[PDB]
């Protein structure tokens, strides 16, 4: 639980500083091991972004389905009449 003294921001990165401003963090794993997973963890985050894009595509397909659902919706509005 040390103090970064802007140095923490200098190495960890300015943008992250938000949550860790608003230490006592794990260092049990080997830094070489941590560097390797962070390559892979960053890859996993990229995969998650790709998945979010896929979910948006799924939402667009759902919207096409909703436009066919639209004729049924017009019939329903007529029924509510």
């Amino acid at each position: 639980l040390v103090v970064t003294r802007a140095e923490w921001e200098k190495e960890l990165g300015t943008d992250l500083v938000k949550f860790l401003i608003e230490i006592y963090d794990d260092f049990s794993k080997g830094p070489k091991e941590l560097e390797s997973i962070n390559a892979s963890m960053k890859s996993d985050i990229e995969n998650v972004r790709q998945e979010v894009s896929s979910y948006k595509e799924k939402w667009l397909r759902d919207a096409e389905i909703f436009g066919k659902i639209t004729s049924i919706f017009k019939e329903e509005l007529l029924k509510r009449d």
């Binding site: 759902d62 919207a63 909703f66 659902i69 639209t70 049924i72 919706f73 329903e76 029924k79």
Partner: peptide
Amino acid sequence: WRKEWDDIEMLMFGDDAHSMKKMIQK
């Protein structure tokens, strides 16, 4: 016949859910 009427009612409920679904899509 009662089961057929209930199926019609379920279809009306699905149409109702249809409006909520359109709202969610918006």
